[PDB]
Amino acid sequence: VASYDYLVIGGGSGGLASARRAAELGARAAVVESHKLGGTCVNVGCVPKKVMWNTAVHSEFMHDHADYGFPSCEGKFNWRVIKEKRDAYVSRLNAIYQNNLTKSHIEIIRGHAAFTSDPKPTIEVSGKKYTAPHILIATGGMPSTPHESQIPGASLGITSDGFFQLEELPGRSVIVGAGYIAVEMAGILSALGSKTSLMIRHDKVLRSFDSMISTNCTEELENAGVEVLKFSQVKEVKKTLSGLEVSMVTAVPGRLPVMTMIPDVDCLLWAIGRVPNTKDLSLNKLGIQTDDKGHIIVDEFQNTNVKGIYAVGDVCGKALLTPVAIAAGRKLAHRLFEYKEDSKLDYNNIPTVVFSHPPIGTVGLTEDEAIHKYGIENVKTYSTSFTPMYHAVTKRKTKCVMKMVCANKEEKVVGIHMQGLGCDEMLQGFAVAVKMGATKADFDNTVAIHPTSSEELVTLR
Amino acid sequence: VASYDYLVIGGGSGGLASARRAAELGARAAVVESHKLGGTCVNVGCVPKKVMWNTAVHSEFMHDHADYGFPSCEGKFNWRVIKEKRDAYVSRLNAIYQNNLTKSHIEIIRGHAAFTSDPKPTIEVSGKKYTAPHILIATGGMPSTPHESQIPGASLGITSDGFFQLEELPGRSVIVGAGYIAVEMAGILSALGSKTSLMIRHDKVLRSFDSMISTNCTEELENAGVEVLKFSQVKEVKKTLSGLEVSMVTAVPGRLPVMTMIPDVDCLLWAIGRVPNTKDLSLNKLGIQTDDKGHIIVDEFQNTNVKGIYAVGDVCGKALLTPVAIAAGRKLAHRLFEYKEDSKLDYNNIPTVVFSHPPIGTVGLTEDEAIHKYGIENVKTYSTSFTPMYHAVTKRKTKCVMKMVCANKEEKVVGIHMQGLGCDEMLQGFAVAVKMGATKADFDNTVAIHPTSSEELVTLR
Ligand SMILES: Cc1cc2nc3c(=O)[nH]c(=O)nc-3n(C[C@H](O)[C@H](O)[C@H](O)COP(=O)(O)OP(=O)(O)OC[C@H]3O[C@@H](n4cnc5c(N)ncnc54)[C@H](O)[C@@H]3O)c2cc1C
Ligand SMILES: Cc1cc2nc3c(=O)[nH]c(=O)nc-3n(C[C@H](O)[C@H](O)[C@H](O)COP(=O)(O)OP(=O)(O)OC[C@H]3O[C@@H](n4cnc5c(N)ncnc54)[C@H](O)[C@@H]3O)c2cc1C
Ligand SMILES: *CC1=C(CCCCCC(=O)O)C(=O)c2ccccc2C1=O
Ligand SMILES: *CC1=C(CCCCCC(=O)O)C(=O)c2ccccc2C1=O
């Protein structure tokens, strides 16, 4: 059996980040990947999603062209064109990167890995055994789809994975879900020309976000032309002559249930959650702990319940973002190969951007979370809403809302929430300030940059 | 004679800001304006400039419309259309603000103001004399134009003031200057279709900015189609049958000087600097101190050399920005009506954005300034350059450059400099962090937001 200092299962964001840092510290490592190196981020997540978002934004530009003094443009979008360019970009990334694994002298093991019953930490790929005193599980996850038994015909729908396989613009789309992936997909499809509906179980999207964001985002979706079907769930899906027929039940509180048949649907996209990839790792052979969802259980140092075995990224079910998987992986490498016992990722104040229209930026606690932690008596919030200057000459409008959540006497900034033009690139710097424990005084004592939307955050009344 | 509790000369950003708050604090102030209320910010500066920049940005992105999968869009810009909408927008702004002015009860005196003798601070406007225990001078400045004795025919050219009076797109434009106003005007004109040249005295633009920015900005201007005329100065201007003829002398080090006659110029714009408005204030009658340039000298509390008289804004020649004039003005009305010996604007680490293409963001010290203040041995810089993923599918390209200047062993961040897409809305948050005395560790400890350009600043190595 081949022996290494570090074995990483999964060549995605978390695995590659941890493997490369370990190698820089001298560790002899190998990465096991059953599919495409790069994982979800480059192949069916972050990167291709952003390219499609940039495309959707270009559609918004086409619409304001006349208002800005130019002759109107046609508007016939060609999905095939961007699809081909997007695929080429992903190919370049996959190539330019594989080179990095080579430069780091990290061995790549192609195939599906599974733990062996060997008393010593050992895995098997294809038919060969590999071992090491340190083994990292970074297998990520996958999109969740309903069972045929629960919702007959569910298999007729696609997920975000299928979204990236599309070669043409669906004429009519129905997205099921209220999370950020559901919101991003609905926004992109609608902006590019698809007659889009977003089906949600309650009254608003992004219910885990601050109330202001949940409310505002739902309203902007409706203003953009996305039909938000509230308190609705899919009961059945059936193939028709034109496409698919979606049977929906709407149960609004205070009203009676009603069934609706949505016809002529070209694309039914399920965006109801993610499930971890742990089913076939033979975790039981070592007694590796997981929850009833399949997530690997870990402590603050990413240790599983078994010595010498760790886990990071989507597989653990906490803060499912690329930079998080990367940071957790690198912090672990320093702990194991630089012997920094205190090296770990701080999961507090992790910033996130949702690429909606306009984009959302948030970091820290929501107003409700702050109230629960410090007591309503010790929480003070500042907020504002305005129409960005960009829309001064356009008929089409979007608004910008910002909220600052402060705690205690010194009004420590414990949360920042916003949606509006430019919020995607505006958040990072404010996140650094929040991580530093900035107070509102720190914000107010920073001179504003005029004229921008960002200056509103340092001039809150 | 008319008497008030606070007299303010100038109805601009610094004047209105101080007076408006003065009224708020229960003060009894009045403001004298010889021209349009609001000042440079709303009439011939910040706001209208940004509307024109947004228009230019629109035009630039639309050149990538076909690359993003849409049918090519023509680009015959109609200047008159935007001019009218811009004027209307400014009108709505003045009205909204005017409602807040009359609300705080502030007497507006029309006419050119000028000081008189009197053993006590007194001013006369159109024959009528006014006075008060506190007089604020906030007359701002104006564009500088060469004297006919120096450059014959110089009066044939316009300045930024005239730029905002333009009702048609000049076919051929020549902008003279290397500062940010010159850079912004050249970029807007060229983006909108004018055959544009930018004449500078040396090799690069923005020489007072960090070397990386000066170099990069000059290159981006050339890549955008702006002809940068280096080591060149205007000697004479003459009216011709088809516009203007600009006589220029070019003297590149190592080469022989040469005379060039630029024909068929439709618009010659002087952007060689600004001078303070104090030539007709008769401040000599009261011994008010000024420098050789005409700037009113003041201390940290904006006090002139004559008790009871203060000055803020562009007229003082330091940090010529709207938020600085506003803040200094508020901090003053604060001191004179709140009694806080420590109340004054901190002029350190003021952030600024230059609306070039792409935009520039900077705060803190340049690498050279830091090297001189801390010593080469105590300064370390981190920098990166990349092509934003927005261009992954476009033939046209712009780059993004970022530089972090650190000082001493803890690597305190004393400067951040960058140019690229989104940098205009990206800077504010980082400025808050720098003002807080953030170190590189603080930046690196903040989790990145992917995929964005802003995350590159927290992952520099
Ligand atoms: C549509 C979509 C949009 C998103 N947008 C964003 C965004 O804008 N920003 C952001 O920060 N995050 C975003 N995310 C989330 C981000 O992509 C994930 O958090 C990140 O990819 C997780 O990294 P990971 O390393 O845990 O797993 P993954 O990158 O999924 O990698 C796990 C790898 O392990 C391999 N593997 C699994 N089992 C085995 C085995 N037994 N043997 C060998 N190899 C195996 C897989 O094939 C895979 O390559 C998005 C996700 C989706 C789905
Ligand atoms: C083209 C251009 C673009 C700019 N872009 C930006 C930008 O994007 N961001 C930024 O922060 N800054 C920008 N600035 C700078 C900003 O506009 C100025 O810093 C700010 O307006 C200065 O405010 P102020 O109150 O000192 O003077 P001003 O606003 O110039 O006001 C002085 C007022 O006093 C009046 N006045 C003068 N003399 C007398 C007198 N004797 N009696 C009565 N009234 C008198 C004037 O007519 C005027 O209205 C720009 C400037 C220009 C020229
Ligand atoms: C998110 C992403 C990935 C997955 C990577 C984590 C790799 C980390 C490391 O080495 O520390 C890529 O593989 C990749 C490749 C080229 C360009 C962009 C990207 C990504 O954004
Ligand atoms: C820059 C600006 C100005 C100039 C003024 C100072 C106003 C300050 C204060 O009273 O506190 C405006 O007058 C104005 C009016 C409406 C909308 C925007 C603006 C500006 O950006």
Swiss-Prot record, chains A, B:
EC number: 1.8.1.7
Quaternary structure, from the entry: Homodimer; disulfide-linked.
Miscellaneous note of the record: The active site is a redox-active disulfide bond.
Role summary: Catalyzes the reduction of glutathione disulfide (GSSG) to reduced glutathione (GSH). Constitutes the major mechanism to maintain a high GSH:GSSG ratio in the cytosol.
Annotated FAD binding sites: 13-14, 33, 40-41, 49, 113, 314, 322, 450
Lineage of origin: Eukaryota, Metazoa, Chordata, Craniata, Vertebrata
Cystine crosslinks: 41-46
PANTHER family hit by this protein: GLUTATHIONE REDUCTASE, GLUTATHIONE REDUCTASE, MITOCHONDRIAL
Name of the molecule in the record: Glutathione reductase, mitochondrial
MF terms in GO: electron transfer activity; flavin adenine dinucleotide binding; glutathione-disulfide reductase (NADPH) activity; NADP binding
Annotated source species: Homo sapiens (Human)
Catalytic activity line of the entry: 2 glutathione + NADP(+) = glutathione disulfide + NADPH + H(+)
Binding of NADP(+), residues: 178, 181, 184, 201, 207, 273, 320, 353
